[PDB]
Write a protein that binds this ligand. Sequence first.
Ligand SMILES: CO[C@H]1O[C@H](CO)[C@@H](O)[C@H](O)[C@@H]1O
Ligand SMILES: [Cl-]
Ligand SMILES: [Cl-]
Length: 138
Amino acid sequence: RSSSYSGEYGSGGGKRFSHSGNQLDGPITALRVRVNTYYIVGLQVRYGKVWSDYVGGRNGDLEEIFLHPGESVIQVSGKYKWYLKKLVFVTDKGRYLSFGKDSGTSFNAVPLHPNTVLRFISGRSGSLIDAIGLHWDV
Ligand SMILES: CO[C@H]1O[C@H](CO)[C@@H](O)[C@H](O)[C@@H]1O
Ligand SMILES: [Cl-]
Ligand SMILES: [Cl-]
């Protein structure tokens, strides 16, 4: 196996979600994060040309970053309490795509195996993002 899973970061509230099928549409090309005063409310990830189903709640402001062609995520750090509060996507182009608020329990996620990148994300959500899981592969 060249695949790995960083997680789960957050708590066990709400229902679960997986973007496992979405990796068939392509690599991660853009990111959507909805953040409010304290939490990360919602997530949406663009695989190839296709956006995923929105997960989370409505109580926040939409933030959106497109990735450069051939750019992939190689590290993910963040913060959480019972709910996810911060997310930072580090890309191989050396960019730091920070979303959310600077407070809580920190985590730092890197792939296990050689030359692997973030392929899809999992986690739990309700009206906020309870938990996130990071999936790595070639
Ligand atoms: C209002 O509560 C809802 O949203 C929170 C945050 O996502 C979840 O923990 C919970 O299970 C419910 O789905
Ligand atoms: Cl930057
Ligand atoms: Cl950390």
